[PDB]
Amino acid sequence: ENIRDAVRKFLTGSTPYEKAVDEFIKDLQKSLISSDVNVKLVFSLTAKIKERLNKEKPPSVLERKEWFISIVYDELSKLFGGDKEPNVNPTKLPFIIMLVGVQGSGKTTTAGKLAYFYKKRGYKVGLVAADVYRPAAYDQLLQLGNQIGVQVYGEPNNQNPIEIAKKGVDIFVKNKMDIIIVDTAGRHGYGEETKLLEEMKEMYDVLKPDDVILVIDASIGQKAYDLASRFHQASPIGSVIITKMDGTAKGGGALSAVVATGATIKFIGTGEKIDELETFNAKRFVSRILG
Numbered sequence: 554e555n556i557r558d559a560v561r562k563f564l565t566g567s568t569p570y571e572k573a574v575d576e577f578i579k580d581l582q583k584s585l586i587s588s589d590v591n592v593k594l595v596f597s598l599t600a601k602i603k604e605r606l607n608k609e610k611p612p613s614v615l616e617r618k619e620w621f622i623s624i625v626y627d628e629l630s631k632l633f634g635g636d637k638e639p640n641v642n643p644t645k646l647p648f649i650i651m652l653v654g655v656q657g658s659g660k661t662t663t664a665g666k667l668a669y670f671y672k673k674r675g676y677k678v679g680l681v682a683a684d685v686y687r688p689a690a691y692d693q694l695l696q697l698g699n700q701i702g703v704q705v706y707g708e709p710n711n712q713n714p715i716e717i718a719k720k721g722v723d724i725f726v727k728n729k730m731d732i733i734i735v736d737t738a739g740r741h742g743y744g745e746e747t748k749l750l751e752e753m754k755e756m757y758d759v760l761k762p763d764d765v766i767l768v769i770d771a772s773i774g775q776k777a778y779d780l781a782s783r784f785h786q787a788s789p790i791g792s793v794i795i796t797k798m799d800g801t802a803k804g805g806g807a808l809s810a811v812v813a814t815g816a817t818i819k820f821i822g823t824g825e826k827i828d829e830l831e832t833f834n835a836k837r838f839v840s841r842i843l844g
């Protein structure tokens with residue numbers, strides 16, 4: 554968002570177009586690089602911009618400055634996810650959504666937010682606490698459920714996440730929930746991403762969820778590429794939610810990195826409150842950062 558005031562500087566006029574453009578371009582590069590966006594993506598973005606500038610003459614009836622900003626808007630939009638806005642509604646009821654992610658990525662919180670998101674859309678939602686590796690997670694999700702009138706199945710003394718998840722899903726299915734959101738986890742520690750993907754697959758093979766969602770903490774910046782890519786390869790149907798887009802400068806890096814894998818981002822988390830979840834739209838994200 555540091556570019557917001559930079560874009561303002563460019564638009565309000567000051568210096569002749571060509572000099573002002575070049576100055577904006579370098580400022581853009583500085584901001585993106587500072588947001589941990591991958592260097593190749595930054596330079597490729599700039600080159601495509603010049604290529605558009607140096608090939609698309611704006612009609613005379615339009616302000617050059619305005620036109621240049623539109624192109625930047627367009628190209629930034631592609632960097633952060635394109636124009637296709639994902640479908641987040643169930644394809645059938647009941648609809649089982651499975652959440653996976655490393656420790657601390659905001660999974661439990663995101664489970665709560667997703668429940669709220671769907672409840673506001675008129676769905677009956679059930680939450681399943683199947684994270685057996687962090688003990689306090691059941692109670693944490695329970696408090697989230699209590700906050701929004703959504704029931705939470707859990708078994709605090711059971712160390713088999715698959716048995717819990719399966720029983721949780723079965724009980725919500727029998728009681729006719731529309732949407733069932735399972736909060737899962739793999740083992741912490743060495744090879745956390747390997748343990749995560751193996752545990753995800755075992756759970757997937759038993760639940761047969763309709764939707765698998767990797768939860769990624771934005772604070773890891775462009776390092777999100779590795780897990781998003783391994784997840785995308787292991788689960789071509791899977792999508793991503795990026796959390797804490799409000800608690801770091803590296804959110805740009807995370808978002809662009811995930812996008813570069815070809816994985817779909819369905820929602821972003823924008824804070825600690827249970828209502829702070831939005832469907833992801835790249836153009837809307839760019840408007841906010843452009844001003």
Ligand SMILES: Nc1nc2c(ncn2[C@@H]2O[C@H](COP(=O)(O)OP(=O)(O)O)[C@@H](O)[C@H]2O)c(=O)[nH]1
Pocket residue numbers: 654655656657658659660661662663687690796797798799800822823824825
């Ligand atoms: N600022 C911000 N904080 C978040 C967001 N999502 C989660 N958190 C915080 O991240 C911490 C861990 O979240 P949690 O759901 O417990 O992660 P988990 O360990 O993967 O289940 C908590 O302190 C949350 O308040 C978000 O979108 N924005």
